Ligand binder design. Structure first.
Ligand SMILES: OC[C@H]1O[C@H](O[C@H]2[C@H](O)[C@@H](O)[C@H](OCCCCC3CCCCC3)O[C@@H]2CO)[C@H](O)[C@@H](O)[C@@H]1O
Ligand SMILES: [Zn+2]
Length: 129
């Protein structure tokens, strides 16, 4: 299977699945940027910093491969809005569960503002590798 990607947006700092790439441009400065179309509107995003390989769901049977200090894309639901953004695992309370669903609790620290939330596996994706 081929590489899929996600891009970070300058509007909200959240990551969105990239559908396709349209063109590119070089800045006076030398930074390279890329015009990205999102799946589901259109943006210039820095290649080095704001585009990476798509995060990957964790299945309950493999919840053990998530550790502290791991970087994860987290579904951060609030008021109304819901953003997928980066946080790091600070701590894990492992639960008693089978392959069907994971009741482990992952305390994450969101990178942007250092706020803290407790998430289920269902609201986190790991990074490749
Ligand atoms: O590249 C900058 C940093 O992040 C990397 O991940 C990112 C990396 O940033 C970025 O350059 C690289 O961009 C690849 C973006 C894909 C460009 C687009 C692809 C479809 C059509 C061709 C053009 O993606 C890496 C993942 O392949 C690496 O994880 C990191 O080591 C590296 O320093
Ligand atoms: Zn688990």
């Amino acid at each position: 299977a081929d590489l899929a990607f996600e891009a970070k947006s300058a509007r909200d700092y959240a990551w969105y699945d990239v559908s396709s790439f349209l063109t590119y441009r070089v800045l006076r400065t030398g930074e390279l940027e890329v015009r990205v179309r999102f799946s589901g509107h259109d943006e210039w995003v820095n290649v080095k910093t704001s585009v990476r390989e798509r995060s990957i769901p964790v299945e309950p049977s493999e919840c053990g491969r998530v550790n502290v200090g791991d970087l994860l894309l987290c579904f951060q639901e609030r008021e109304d809005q819901a953003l997928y953004c980066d946080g790091h695992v600070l701590n894990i309370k492992r639960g008693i569960h089978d392959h069907a669903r994971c009741n482990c609790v992952f305390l994450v620290r969101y990178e942007l503002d250092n706020t803290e939330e407790s998430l289920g596996l269902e609201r986190i994706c790991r990074r490749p590798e």
